[PDB]
């Protein structure tokens with residue numbers, strides 16, 4: 519019978535790829551359908567390029583793809599429209615914001631699978647040790663805490679200890695971290711939903727100069743090559759006071775044999791001042807049936823299974839990844855395992871989006887511009903003022919004649 523082949527998630531990021539393969543195998547066993555899992559590189563932008571090889575070829579060699587929240591406007595031609603396959607009631611069980619994100623010129627490109635938002639991880643044992651009662655609310659506070667805790671932990675002999683780790687590598691994750699910096703300084707959304715390229719302003723420039731000021735000071739010099747897992751591994755070994763990362767890191771830090779098990783909490787990222795907005799960049803992944811799949815019916819069945827209540831529950835309980843079904847946020851088992859899902863639900867709902875809707879199919883080019891200009895500030899090549907002016911000019915060229 520048919521072999522249903524799935525490309526999604528990566529065995530190089532946490533347990534996501536292993537868990538995904540397990541879920542696809544469970545569907546295959548449940549339905550008596552052969553399945554195969556195709557692995558992917560860690561970074562989302564490398565995955566996009568890989569999957570674009572399949573799509574360009576109209577390849578039938580992958581039936582189901584796990585696609586990033588930023589991709590629908592790029593990948594729509596390659597997606598089977600799912601709208602005819604779901605009832606209005608089925609579709610209402612997901613967050614409407616994500617269903618809307620995944621709908622491009624009427625085509626339901628993909629079902630919401632898990633959402634994501636950037637959050638602050640903090641070592642509560644260390645905050646207590648050094649006389650702090652709450653995590654930092656402002657970036658200045660985060661810097662002051664990091665400097666004091668670092669000074670003490672270095673003096674006590676942990677030469678591997680840093681104050682803050684984050685994603686500073688030149689790739690899509692840096693666009694995520696930088697949106698949070700810029701937005702949390704009142705510097706805007708880089709490209710506004712209306713199309714205005716707003717990034718050339720002094721608040722955005724200050725945000726980027728501040729992040730430069732971390733590098734080699736409270737954050738490792740090598741932070742400029744960190745993606746999610748590099749940051750996580752310094753954190754998880756017990757070598758950072760603070761980390762910016764996504765929800766998946768929580769379950770991994772609580773696992774038996776983690777050096778930091780029981781020693782951390784999570785909160786919203788800091789912001790420049792009390793009247794700036796909170797920033798958490800919206801992430802997450804969706805499930806797309808290939809337009810080139812020879813087995814659309816079977817593939818839609820697998821996608822509905824993966825997106826179901828019990829598979830998303832399993833994702834929440836075991837991998838601390840955020841459901842796209844509001845009903846799961848009231849599930850007693852989800853909440854007992856992850857109480858912080860309730861505490862931060864409003865942060866998740868108010869997550870700020872990257873400019874993928876407004877840039878549409880040109881988003882990847884826009885983002886490459888952003889992460890390269892931001893990276894030039896982190897590396898000390900440019901000051902924030904020059905980088906936001908140069909970025910404005912690049913994005914203007916990229917989006918000229920796009921509506």
Ligand SMILES: OC[C@H]1O[C@H](O[C@H]2O[C@H](CO)[C@@H](O)[C@H](O)[C@H]2O)[C@H](O)[C@@H](O)[C@@H]1O
Pocket residue numbers: 527528531534560561562586587588633634690691692694746764765766800801802803
């Ligand atoms: O939360 C775990 C996921 O982390 C990655 O995806 C997030 O980070 C990306 C940038 O590096 C975003 O574009 C994406 O929207 C976020 O969800 C990783 O690519 C995923 O495989 C992980 O599941």
